[PDB]
Each structure stands twice: as structure tokens, then as C-alpha cells.
Design a protein around this nucleic acid. Sequence first.
DNA 1: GGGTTTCCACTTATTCGACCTTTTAG
DNA 2: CCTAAAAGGTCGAATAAGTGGAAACC
Length: 294
Amino acid sequence: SSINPWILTGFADAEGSFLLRIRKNNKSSVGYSTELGFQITLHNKDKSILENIQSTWGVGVIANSGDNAVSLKVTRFEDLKVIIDHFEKYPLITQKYADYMLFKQAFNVMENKEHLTIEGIKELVRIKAKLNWGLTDELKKAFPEIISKERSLINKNIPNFKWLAGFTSGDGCFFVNLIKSKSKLGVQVQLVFSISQHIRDKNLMNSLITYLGCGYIKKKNKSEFSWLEFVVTKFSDIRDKIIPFFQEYTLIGTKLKDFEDWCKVAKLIEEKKHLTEEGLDEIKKIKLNMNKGR
DNA sequence: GGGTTTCCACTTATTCGACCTTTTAG
DNA sequence: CCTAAAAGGTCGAATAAGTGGAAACC
Ligand SMILES: [Ca+2]
Ligand SMILES: [Ca+2]
Ligand SMILES: [Ca+2]
Ligand SMILES: [Ca+2]
């Protein structure tokens, strides 16, 4: 069905990863082989998005990824030209853009077939050192060196509303909270919209307040890790801003159905049916089919 | 047919999503 | 007193990123 290219780039900001493998290989002339590419891993229920993306781009192979997940991997060298073209025209805007640029530099090394020389393998190692998690211990041991060039700090604005629809389809969440008290009904129904993201993109998440004209930021930490949530819990902002936004700029994948169910609940709250017993049980049943499982 | 690419099965680290209860604000 | 909104978390892998092994090329 062909995905809008900005929907795709938002989705990639939220679900894509680049990869640069530099593998010790006794069968290779320089003792190392490589593999360059881009991949997306989703729950099986979202296999269709990957099928559709594959068809849109015309590249990539789909395979299971463990018990409950499926992946679209693009590593065939010629096919990376499609990836490069797309992200040149519709650039990523999270810190993943830097990983993209690292990926582009490795592609050039290999385009010139330098990866078949030891000096080329060393270049890819330097490029890899700043990519994603960086070098393994093995590579750190075989190519000891000081990485001087620090990572480039991406600072780009939400380019348009479609990017944000694709982004939310990846890392967003539409949730029906059941706040149990002791009232006559003893359950307050609260719609929650949120987007989760690593602290490295706090500026982008922060901007969502101005961009959507509602919501707020929760900072979260656990040991050495830090992440951020853009959250909307105000019903009037759900009704007047959040819902209309995704009614026009469509979500993709199964989260679309979560949003639809979310909306059915929202209409029930707008009719004050969440305050009756019969509406509550309706809301309960709708919640049961949402998000995990479905 | 040797070196290199590309694929498919599966894992590791940890960034997400999804789920809770309480406190506070109207 | 009643209900909505926010605060303040927990849980666990649908996380983001990576790895082992080998078939398919040229
Ligand atoms: Ca993400
Ligand atoms: Ca993913
Ligand atoms: Ca996701
Ligand atoms: Ca729940």
C-alpha cells in the first residue's frame, strides 16, 4: 500500500537501527569481513508494516526475530542506495541521524571496496567506534586507539505532522488507566497519551509541549539509564488536540487499533458514561483487548 | 570455487511501552 | 463530597542493538 515517506522516517526514528558488522574471518584476505545495513524489529502482529515497507522501498528481507518478534533487515549492498536516497530526502531527526551519517561514511568506504584492505577495515572500526554501542571488547583489543572525534549532537525540529504520526506509531502509547478508589463506582477512568524516549533527545520530547500545545514531561531513571515521557492526561486536551491530530495524520500498525479503541473510550467519557456502571464495564471490556496481546 | 556477500536463526542490553497506585487539584 | 489531573512509580521484553553460523553468490 506504500507508506508516506515522512511517516516512514518518523517510524525509523522510533524503530530503526543501523548496523556495521566487522567480523574476524579466517577466510577473508585481511582477516575481517563486514556487513552494513539497516533494520527494524517489531512484534509479529506488526509484520504487515515491514511487508509494506519492504514493498515501498523494494528492499530488505523479513525474518522471525525470536519467539514473538519479526525483523526487516536491509544489508544487500546495492539496496543500501535506496536507504541512503530515502534518508537524504527525508532526514531522521533524533540522535539516530548521527548513526545514519556514520552508516553513510561506512557505505562510502565499502563502495570504494576499501573494506578489502586492512586500512579500510581500520577506517570502518573508527566509524564503528562512534556508532550505536561502539566497539566490542574484541575490536577494542585488535585496534586499540583513542577515538578523538566526539559524536555529533543532532538538533533538528519536528519537520512536519506526518513525521510525528510515524514516530508515535513506534514509541507512543494510548492507555486507559483505571484509578481504583472507594467512590460509589470506585474506578476513575483516565485516558493517558504518552511518548517514551531516551534522555539523549530531551530537547525533542520537550518541544512536543509547544508542538501539540498540551502535555508535560516525566523524567525517569533506573541505575545508569535515563529516559523521558511526553504525557497528556488532560481530557480536554485529548479531545481537542491529541485525538484530532491522529484522526488526520494516521497511525500505522496495530497501534492504530489501540488508538481507535482509545477513542471509543473517549467518546464514552465525553458522554459521562464512564460514570455509570454499564459504561464502566464497557470501558473495562474495551481496555482488555488493547495494547499487550490484542 | 575462494573470497566475499547475503541470508536466516537467535541473543544481549536495556529503551521503551504498558501497566499500577497515591496524591493533589478543581 | 465528588471527579479529574497529576505525580510517582513498577514491570519486563512487543526495548535498541547485536551475534553465530552458513548458504549464495561472482
Ligand atoms: Ca525508539
Ligand atoms: Ca523495535
Ligand atoms: Ca514499538
Ligand atoms: Ca492497567
